[PDB]
């Protein structure tokens, strides 16, 4: 129903907001007052209806087709959460199949060979979670990154994951804020975070910069570093530059970092890398660019666009067959179940708002 005026800010501070298609609306400013002042008019549906706040404004987490569904989506949400920050999320303990399963084996071919070829991250996630069940938050907002809950061996876990299918799985401002806050939600209520990373880097755009992606993408970094719940991150393919750190990297304190052999952990992609590097070689003996540049871009890809340099330094705990992911997550959560850390007293941090 209508949440009008300053009332709007209450739900804003709550962790999750759920609303239904055509029978709910939120706004600090009605559209009559809007026309009177800015000159523009609109309806309640497109100003602050459920859909707009789920795809555009980022203020809502779920758009239910119906009130009964909505009341059902709240129930699910609760089921992944503890009653307060003094308990673990409620577990329905079950034993994992610790051998390799046919489902597991599907991951060894999930990754296409052409970097430009995107695969569906929902899949990789469902292969890891109990009953291939993934309860997703804000699927309409910033579809370029995926967030939500699931269970591993009966214990609620949360997910953050770059989604190649949508805008090449690139990080942007909306993705950062969506994810940043979901990570902090899980942290506050003691649910482990699992991160799946295929990430080219940041969405190029002047609109992006002119609204300080700088202080926006920094939120995600802060959330991971501030976190004390178990953190296990899996790199399925791309980890480039600033983005690598952003997505739950070890340097930010992640407990277990794992890479598939299809992972590329480097400062930047091959092409942009050699234009900078040995730019001397390309220009001189300069028949055309391609000749030496191509041989250089692949001398480079084959040499560094692996997860292995990362691996010789311990930045990544292991390089694994993808079909072993679920079993790695399972065994890791088990050991990480008793994780405890500390830090200098503060009233609170000063996260880039």
């Amino acid at each position: 129903g209508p949440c009008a005026g300053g009332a709007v800010y209450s739900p804003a501070i709550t962790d999750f907001t759920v609303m239904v298609d055509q029978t709910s609306h939120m706004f600090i400013t009605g559209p009559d007052v809007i026309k009177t002042v800015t000159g523009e008019d609109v309806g309640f549906e497109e100003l602050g209806g459920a859909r707009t706040h789920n795809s555009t404004s980022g203020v809502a987490h779920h758009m239910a087709g119906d009130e009964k569904d909505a009341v059902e989506y709240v129930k699910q949400l609760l089921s992944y959460l503890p009653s307060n920050n003094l308990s673990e999320p409620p577990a329905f303990p079950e034993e994992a199949d610790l051998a390799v399963t046919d489902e597991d084996a599907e991951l060894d071919t999930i990754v296409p060979d052409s970097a430009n070829q995107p695969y569906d991250m929902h899949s990789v996630i469902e292969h890891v979670l109990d009953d291939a069940e993934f309860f997703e938050t804000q699927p309409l907002f910033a579809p370029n990154i995926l967030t939500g809950f699931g269970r591993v061996e009966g214990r609620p876990v949360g997910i953050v994951a770059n989604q190649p299918m949508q805008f090449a799985g690139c990080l942007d401002i909306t993705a950062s804020e969506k994810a940043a806050r979901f990570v902090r939600t899980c942290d506050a209520f003691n649910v482990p975070v699992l991160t799946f990373v295929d990430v080219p880097g940041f969405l190029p755009g002047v609109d992006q910069e002119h609204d300080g992606i700088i202080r926006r993408g920094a939120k995600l970094i802060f959330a991971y570093a501030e976190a004390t719940v178990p953190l296990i991150t899996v790199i399925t393919r791309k980890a480039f530059g600033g983005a690598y750190n952003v997505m739950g990297s070890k340097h930010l304190g992640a407990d277990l970092n794992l890479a598939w052999p299809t992972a590329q952990i480097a400062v930047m992609g091959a092409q942009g890398a050699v234009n900078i590097l040995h730019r001397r070689t390309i220009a001189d003996a300069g028949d055309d660019a391609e000749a030496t540049r191509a041989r250089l871009i692949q001398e480079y890809e084959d040499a560094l666009l692996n997860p292995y340099t990362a691996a010789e330094r311990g930045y990544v705990d292991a390089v694994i067959m993808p079909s072993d992911t679920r079993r790695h997550i399972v065994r890791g959560l088990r050991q990480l179940r008793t994780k405890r850390e500390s830090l200098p007293p503060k009233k609170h941090g000063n996260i880039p708002l």
Partner: protein
């Protein structure tokens, strides 16, 4: 191939094979011959069958002085990781005499710091399997740093998580 995912998969398996066998088949025989086991193997016997999860298996040193640059064996003379003993969590490192006389390098010390930090953080015992000729002199002060990073972890952990040293 290697420009395909499947070529990458199979690339990883050769890697595993080489790290699983860092030392020469000869030094392997020669440790057996003194009547003792390999670094791995000592772990196998220690941990519940199937529980060992290895850390830093493909770590490699960065020492250039002398001819170490020539030989950079996966792991770096030490096998490390976590698992269970009788169903209870444990963190383990095991020194590979089979490698550089088992001489403690800098990466080799980093691997040890990593399991010590892991155990301290999750609250499990650390079992240290010691089988080494001493400091890997070639890397100079760096080895002395490694030792130090460990002594300090040992001290901070003292009376927090059990630490057992198996010296073989």
């Amino acid at each position: 191939d290697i420009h395909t995912t499947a070529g990458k998969l199979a690339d990883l398996r050769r890697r595993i094979e080489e790290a699983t066998h860092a030392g020469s088949a000869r030094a392997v025989e020669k440790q057996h011959a003194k009547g003792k086991l390999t670094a791995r193997e000592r772990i196998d016997l220690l941990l519940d069958e199937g529980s060992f999860v290895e850390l830093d298996e493909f770590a490699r040193h960065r020492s250039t002085n002398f001819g170490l640059d020539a030989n950079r064996p996966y792991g770096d003379g030490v096998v490390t990781g976590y698992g269970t003993v009788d169903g209870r969590p444990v963190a383990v490192f095991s020194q590979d005499f089979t490698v550089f006389g088992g001489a403690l390098g800098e990466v080799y010390g980093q691997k040890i710091v990593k399991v010590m930090d892991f155990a301290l953080k999750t609250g499990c015992p650390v079992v240290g399997i010691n089988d080494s000729g001493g400091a890997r002199i070639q890397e100079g002060v760096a080895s002395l740093g490694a030792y130090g990073e460990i002594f300090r972890r040992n001290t901070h952990a003292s009376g927090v998580i059990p630490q057992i040293s198996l010296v073989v």
